[PDB]
Design a protein around this ligand. Sequence first.
Ligand SMILES: [Mg+2]
Ligand SMILES: [Mg+2]
Ligand SMILES: [Mg+2]
Ligand SMILES: [Mg+2]
Ligand SMILES: [Mg+2]
Ligand SMILES: [Mg+2]
Ligand SMILES: [Mg+2]
Ligand SMILES: [Mg+2]
Ligand SMILES: [Mg+2]
Ligand SMILES: [Mg+2]
Ligand SMILES: [Mg+2]
Ligand SMILES: [Mg+2]
Ligand SMILES: [Mg+2]
Ligand SMILES: [Mg+2]
Ligand SMILES: [Mg+2]
Ligand SMILES: [Mg+2]
Ligand SMILES: [Mg+2]
Ligand SMILES: [Mg+2]
Ligand SMILES: [Mg+2]
Ligand SMILES: [Mg+2]
Ligand SMILES: [Mg+2]
Ligand SMILES: [Mg+2]
Ligand SMILES: [Mg+2]
Ligand SMILES: [Mg+2]
Ligand SMILES: [Mg+2]
Ligand SMILES: [Mg+2]
Ligand SMILES: [Mg+2]
Ligand SMILES: [Mg+2]
Ligand SMILES: [Mg+2]
Ligand SMILES: [Mg+2]
Ligand SMILES: [Mg+2]
Ligand SMILES: [Mg+2]
Ligand SMILES: [Mg+2]
Ligand SMILES: [Mg+2]
Ligand SMILES: [Mg+2]
Ligand SMILES: [Mg+2]
Ligand SMILES: [Mg+2]
Ligand SMILES: [Mg+2]
Lengths: 246, 203, 53, 38, 207
Amino acid sequence: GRVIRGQRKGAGSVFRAHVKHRKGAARLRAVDFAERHGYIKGIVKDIIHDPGRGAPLAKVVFRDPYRFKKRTELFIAAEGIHTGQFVYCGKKAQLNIGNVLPVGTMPEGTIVCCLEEKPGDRGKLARASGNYATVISHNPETKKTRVKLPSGSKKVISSANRAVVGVVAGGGRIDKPILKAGRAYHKYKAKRNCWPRVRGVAMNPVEHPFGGGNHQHIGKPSTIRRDAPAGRKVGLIAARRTGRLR
Amino acid sequence: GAYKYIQELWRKKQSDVMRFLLRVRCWQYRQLSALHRAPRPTRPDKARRLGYKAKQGYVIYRIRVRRGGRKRPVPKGATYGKPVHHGVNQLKFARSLQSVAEERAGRHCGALRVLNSYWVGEDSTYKFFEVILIDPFHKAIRRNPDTQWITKPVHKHREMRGLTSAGRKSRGLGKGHKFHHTIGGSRRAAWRRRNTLQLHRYR
Amino acid sequence: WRRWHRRVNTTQKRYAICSALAASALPALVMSKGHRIEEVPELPLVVEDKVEG
Amino acid sequence: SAKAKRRNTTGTGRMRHLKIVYRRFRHGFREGTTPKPK
Amino acid sequence: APSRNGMILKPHFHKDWQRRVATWFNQPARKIRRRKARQARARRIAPRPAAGPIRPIVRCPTVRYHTKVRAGRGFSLEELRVAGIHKKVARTIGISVDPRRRNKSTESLQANVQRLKEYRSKLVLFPRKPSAPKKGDSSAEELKLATQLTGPVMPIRNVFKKEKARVITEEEKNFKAFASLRMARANARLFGIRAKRAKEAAEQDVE
RNA sequence: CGCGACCUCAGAUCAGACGUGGCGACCCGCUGAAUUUAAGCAUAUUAGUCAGCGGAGGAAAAGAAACUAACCAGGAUUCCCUCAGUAACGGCGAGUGAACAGGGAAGAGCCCAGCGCCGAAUCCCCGCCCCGCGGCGGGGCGCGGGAAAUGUGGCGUACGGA
RNA sequence: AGCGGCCCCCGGCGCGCCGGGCCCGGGUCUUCCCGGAGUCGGGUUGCUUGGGAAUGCAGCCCAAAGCGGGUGGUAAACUCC
RNA sequence: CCGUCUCGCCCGCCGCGCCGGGGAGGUGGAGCACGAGCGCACGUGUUAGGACCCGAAAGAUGGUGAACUAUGCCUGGGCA
RNA sequence: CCGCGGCGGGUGUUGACGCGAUGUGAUUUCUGCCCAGUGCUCUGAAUGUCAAAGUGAAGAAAUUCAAUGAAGCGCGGGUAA
Ligand SMILES: [Mg+2]
Ligand SMILES: [Mg+2]
Ligand SMILES: [Mg+2]
Ligand SMILES: [Mg+2]
Ligand SMILES: [Mg+2]
Ligand SMILES: [Mg+2]
Ligand SMILES: [Mg+2]
Ligand SMILES: [Mg+2]
Ligand SMILES: [Mg+2]
Ligand SMILES: [Mg+2]
Ligand SMILES: [Mg+2]
Ligand SMILES: [Mg+2]
Ligand SMILES: [Mg+2]
Ligand SMILES: [Mg+2]
Ligand SMILES: [Mg+2]
Ligand SMILES: [Mg+2]
Ligand SMILES: [Mg+2]
Ligand SMILES: [Mg+2]
Ligand SMILES: [Mg+2]
Ligand SMILES: [Mg+2]
Ligand SMILES: [Mg+2]
Ligand SMILES: [Mg+2]
Ligand SMILES: [Mg+2]
Ligand SMILES: [Mg+2]
Ligand SMILES: [Mg+2]
Ligand SMILES: [Mg+2]
Ligand SMILES: [Mg+2]
Ligand SMILES: [Mg+2]
Ligand SMILES: [Mg+2]
Ligand SMILES: [Mg+2]
Ligand SMILES: [Mg+2]
Ligand SMILES: [Mg+2]
Ligand SMILES: [Mg+2]
Ligand SMILES: [Mg+2]
Ligand SMILES: [Mg+2]
Ligand SMILES: [Mg+2]
Ligand SMILES: [Mg+2]
Ligand SMILES: [Mg+2]
């Protein structure tokens, strides 16, 4: 049997990501003594933007208190950021947009973004075009804090990480239908290579288990168990329901 | 004096003393590299019963070897052939891990000639050893009349041809009814003497 | 390894020697073999021991 | 391929040291001495 | 595809045998090599015995062969402690010594000590320095008559005693041989049961 | 915070030494299949074989018993004849298949650790001189320096030994 | 052809000294000392061999002993050699 | 003569017994009943080996190719 | 998802308006009834069947017999774009 394409995207040869023009990793600022006892001032220098992927970045320049030098950084821009806006950053930080302050101190029901799942890893959650997490509760003993994610799920995070305040700028992107075809083509000429999907019934039976036959039909049930071999795991992966609920 | 009963200490391996000294030394050894030189042998008892005189020339390394069998280096399954020769998981290697350790520490330092090896510690996934190496051309080894047999060019790489005591077990030889099939030189010429036709002149 | 050589028994090798010595004494089986023996005075020709000198 | 060796072996080229070792062997690799000076 | 009546047989040639075939065309040019390396060995040691030092008299095992006497490896250390010879001189005068032999009998110990006493009286021993002997050396007479001994020294020969023709006793007419061989077979098979039923009767007779 | 000492560990275009790659007829160590036979075929056989990989030598390996036999007992290894196409294994089908004894070629045997005794009784290198030095060695001298009591030499090893 | 001749070269081994090195052996009797340890062996899984209730090798866990230990071709105990 | 079944009687002895030995009558055996083999050479016949010569479709180990064509990339060029 | 292998590698300089796996085929218009079957999933001591190990008894022992017994199949609910 020939190797189906799902058993062929895990090589790393032609399905790599186009990382030439990407201006840099949208990290956060690290931890130190100042971000644990006070705050520190940023001087946003421009809003240089990568529509390499579709979310706007931010150039934030900090005064570094160890050597005589100016550390640059990058962030993800919240909604309503100027050009020239004193972004503060720390734990004693006052509460408005652009500032970044720990999770344990902000009150309940505050719309945040770019949370750190662990008390320091420089930003890993809710950073896409137009999403926001909400802080649900707190707990003074055991030092934890609940939060609801934009999926719908909930999760417990220790109340020592950090988060910017405000939603991600770039919302409303899922509208304006791509009525053209090659305008999705110039979208996936960027990041990576998977766009012209060929359905499985059209294929021959040597590269897809569903295919083959005279009539375009499946024969086998599309729903498959998870404890399955690689290359059979092609259909609906696991089911709790399969239908018409709206 | 002591060497008679350091010997009898180093077979209290279940006791609380040696369960401490190994629950320490295996950790110390685990943060080091895979093949490094120690200046003196951890066991002098066992070291002297193999030929380690404490003079100039003799060197002692210390190497780690990972553990387990050997599964066959094929793609996914796909061992083409009859269904006897499908087996990939549960195969077992013929030579021991002790003469793996000897020839890993016998090829990396090619200017030396291996004498023997011994045991030190064990983890879940690691077996440690010690080795003894000899300078062939140093004047102290050279002018000894007893042990200038090494410098002869015959005894190059004793460990690749299988001559150490760790490979002598793998060859399968001795005397008796238990060792029929290595009469002659080895296992091969015990095959060659048999599966040939001696065609005489007159017959 | 074609079988080159042969072996013959012992007591046939000695019977052929006795049957080749018994016919170097007749003056007919020597003339008919081809030699020139018209004049030799005695067929088992025995000469003195000073020829080894 | 026992044919691709004999395209590239020892008996092919010059042997610019082996042919004067095959000559020096038969006198036990003498050095130093000379024929008698006359 | 066998025909009417021939024997069944299994030839062992299904393997590739033409690759490993040992010819023997060497043979009449190796009996000459061994003949030269044996005669140039026989002229290196000019008055010594050519056939190795003398070798002991030993029976043979395995009831098929237990009525012969053949050569051995070397003398033991009882056959040298009794004969009064030190065990590392005997290596230097041509006496084979192996330390791995027992002596469970006596009648071969004696005939070995006697054979040593023969060889010690045949042995011509040269002086170290041909100007000065020892107490036990030999005279300048025998040196001129010293020569080699080709062949195995004091060859081991199987001798048999003889007996003449006796007159038959009146007794041996009444000796039944076969009902004694089949009594010793029955008595040699019933040694455990006969000695066990008597024990069971000694456990039963306490009542 | 000092001068100090053993330990563990690095750097050098430090002094003097070494190994690395080739040939691959014979050799030792691993790895190792399928055609083919069975009138099919999957255990078997083809085979511990070709290919593949790493090491040597003028020869390599083996080797002085944790041995064979139940005899009135032999007595290191290798090599030829023999046992033998035999005891045995095996869809008990096709087929694979040893050794001991006996006669012969060759003949050779040994040392350390431990146990203990002799005042480290031990080596290697640097220095000066004399002899010889196209295989770098011997004797004399070095208040000249280094390694070894985590054990250097002598006697001594299962045939008993001191 | 021939124990025929001549001219060179390197050795094998025999003898004189001149040098240094090493002072060691038997037998008979009294008193002392004497041996190799994650290995033997046991269970198990896998390849193997003519080796068949498992010849060898290798892997995992368990793990010894001094009138003791292994072998003594059918597994198992008690025995004697 | 050996193997095996049926009927039933006497004898032996350092060991006295679940010891040992003997008879008549049918049945199974590649056996005796005054030898016929051993070693060599030649011939046919059946077989195992490449096996009267030529002939496949395939199967396995180990290696060489994206200078044509298939797709993603970098860098440049062209469309009255 | 790759891979003989490790703290290995791509997706990922990524984070649910995001990755990945499928069936239909513009818009307008509608998309019916059936969960018994084959699949899929969830409650499982609500339990019939269920290895090795570790446990008990009888034996001189090798052994033999009993209790207990994970997943999954069985039984019970959900699901037809
Ligand atoms: Mg088509
Ligand atoms: Mg398929
Ligand atoms: Mg249909
Ligand atoms: Mg098969
Ligand atoms: Mg060995
Ligand atoms: Mg026919
Ligand atoms: Mg240098
Ligand atoms: Mg195999
Ligand atoms: Mg077939
Ligand atoms: Mg056919
Ligand atoms: Mg077929
Ligand atoms: Mg075979
Ligand atoms: Mg096989
Ligand atoms: Mg193999
Ligand atoms: Mg090969
Ligand atoms: Mg090489
Ligand atoms: Mg050479
Ligand atoms: Mg050798
Ligand atoms: Mg050897
Ligand atoms: Mg011995
Ligand atoms: Mg033997
Ligand atoms: Mg026969
Ligand atoms: Mg059958
Ligand atoms: Mg024999
Ligand atoms: Mg001889
Ligand atoms: Mg010594
Ligand atoms: Mg000592
Ligand atoms: Mg087999
Ligand atoms: Mg092993
Ligand atoms: Mg038995
Ligand atoms: Mg017994
Ligand atoms: Mg016929
Ligand atoms: Mg033919
Ligand atoms: Mg096939
Ligand atoms: Mg190109
Ligand atoms: Mg493309
Ligand atoms: Mg659909
Ligand atoms: Mg249904």
